[PDB]
Symmetry: D3
Subunit: 152 residues, 6 copies
């Protein structure tokens, strides 16, 4: 449908989310890039958020735990254009009860066209990118026109 | 233990959501109960919310459209205890792309134990219940004890 | 789609189903409302059924266990107009093997427009509704007309 | 879990089901095997059943249409040991709203261990197999034991 | 859509896949038919493959374990016409994380119209079928015409 | 589980896949990055592969169409370590018949820890990252040890 533009700020609002068997990976990743991450705004789901702040002293805006709605809170923030980057390490080897929430979240990150990482390799390539700390124009769906065509 | 208590106010915060093929059904339902619904606070996804407001003249807090993240916004409000009742007329005869969002939303409504109607019959029974206009206590999981246990 | 009507008898045919982690939740709910439930016809899936009759002494028409086909037996009965109310406490925090059966059962309960509760709050609202003990009409899809078109 | 046995009678109770895009495929298959199928008991979902009846003239016990509950009716019969063979030509190239019912039906057919064909090739192999026309014993889960242990 | 034909060779390429809870049931099925299976070419997912080889001494082309991609490797071979029969005993009573890989594999087997068995009864009917050791023509999508219309 | 490492060659093996409604976006994206891509080895699903080679003249190893097995062929290549990067613009606003294949493919990409992009924003950050043209070590699961424990 109709697409418009949005500018990701130089200072990104990053969401960090990880499944239990993936928390250790996210932790190491975060500790390895702390100096850089400290330059942006950090958000996370309940458990993930607390484990990170307690371990690194970084300021993290913790949302509810994933199974309790954290994923949907993050999804909502992305739709509202309040989250610019999503680092979501989900477990591809273990059945998760909130699997629909997981798919719904990834679905929204895809439609709102924001940088998304589901593994370390992708996360490294993203944060080591030269424009990670710059303003970046992205194409996003034009809700205004979308809804307008719906009310006709 | 693992559960606590929440009190639903007399003036309920109602979320109204409907798939395209079920919108007429929801519209009719809303019209036949405009008198009572006017005494409560209404929320709704994009398209649904506008249609209702333009047809009945009631104040409706419209969020994004479902496919664009509206379901997750509703789910978020529910997890935050800002939505007391959910009327979600999803289409059981049509496949939708935001199906994971649909499932995730119903999953949260189940978790947070709030009144949920997925069809007209259930909506009618719920709205005709006595203390529907009264303050009612519901059992909800104790998030504090939950998160605390997570961070052991 | 064409719609016709069906009359819910005063003495409702209630199906009671609960996943393992919600069984104590359902049991407790049934005992609290025994004086009321005793006035209706009860049906349930294998395990749930036996646990109820053995704990309350009430007569329950037990079907097969969910995983073994119980869910579909209930779905069939619903489509056939033999079940008027569905109380299905599925687990929102645990993945189950018969998940497709769960979704298929809730899909049909939605299609045939009967009161459905997936949590305690909704269930309480339904049974306290004034017409829970009266005969009431509900709108249902007109199958004959639906099939005629299919063969048109 | 403990297993027991069930006998599949010579005269089989067959459930015939097909998605719209696969109906023609099932119709052709049923027509070229009519002489044999006429010897067994046929069951089908609503639309499929009616189409087969008027096209071949055979007697078919039509259940409700799939989207309307037909699939679960068939599942119910299978779990009750009333269906011996399932011919389900579902469409692998088109999204279906009753997808959960489709997966649920197939899950049950697996559980109760009855012959199941989801395509023509499997359907042909099945009906050309010797035990299709005679009684044969199959292993099934022992429900009694299963339920007893649950309690 | 547009169809064409393929001929399964008398000597079939069989893929054997089973979830943990169904492995033993697959082992018993294999040994019970070893004489016949010995005359064919066997493929299997990682764990399943090695278990069969070590127990019967039959040669088996072992692929990666299912969760690691083995289901997709089998799916790939099927679409390439390298697999003629699929014996997939998936667990109908236990959810697996690679559930999508399971559905995708079954979806392809359906599309490419090859004999497929998800339980013992179906597997026995197919294996006991007369033309199991003969060349058999099956109808398959005409990929050429298919891709041609796309562009 | 036990992990090991793998080195992604400087000259990457890239898989390009896109759903119909996303083909135009991928196309123009490839054209705008043609100079970079020309120095690598490209793979793609049926339709997508031909459209690209036809419009850019680049050499593309085309597999089968996704709905016909293409996604599984790609997943197979990934698990075998023959694909280093995956660009998959799947349609988040459309229900696809091969949905399971789509998820299975994304699941493997996650498991094998290779760079993956599902939208333009992510694709741009990845291709501009410095290590894109350099040999890179990634953490992958140790299959040998994994399989050995399975046969214990």
């Amino acid at each position: 449908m109709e697409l418009t533009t949005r500018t990701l700020p130089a200072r990104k609002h990053i969401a960090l989310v990880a499944h239990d068997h993936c928390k250790q990976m996210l932790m190491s990743w975060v500790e390895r890039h702390q100096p850089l991450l400290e330059q942006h705004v950090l958000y996370a789901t309940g458990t993930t958020g607390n484990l990170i702040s307690r371990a690194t002293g970084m300021n993290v805006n913790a949302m509810l735990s994933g199974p309790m709605g954290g994923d949907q809170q993050v999804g909502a923030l992305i739709s509202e254009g309040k989250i610019d980057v999503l680092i979501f390490f989900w477990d591809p080897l273990n059945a998760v009860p909130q699997d629909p929430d997981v798919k719904a979240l990834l679905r929204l990150a895809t439609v709102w066209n924001i940088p998304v990482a589901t593994n370390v390799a992708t996360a490294d390539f993203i944060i080591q990118s030269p424009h990670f700390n710059d303003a970046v124009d992205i194409l996003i769906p034009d809700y205004q026109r979308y809804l307008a065509d719906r009310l006709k």
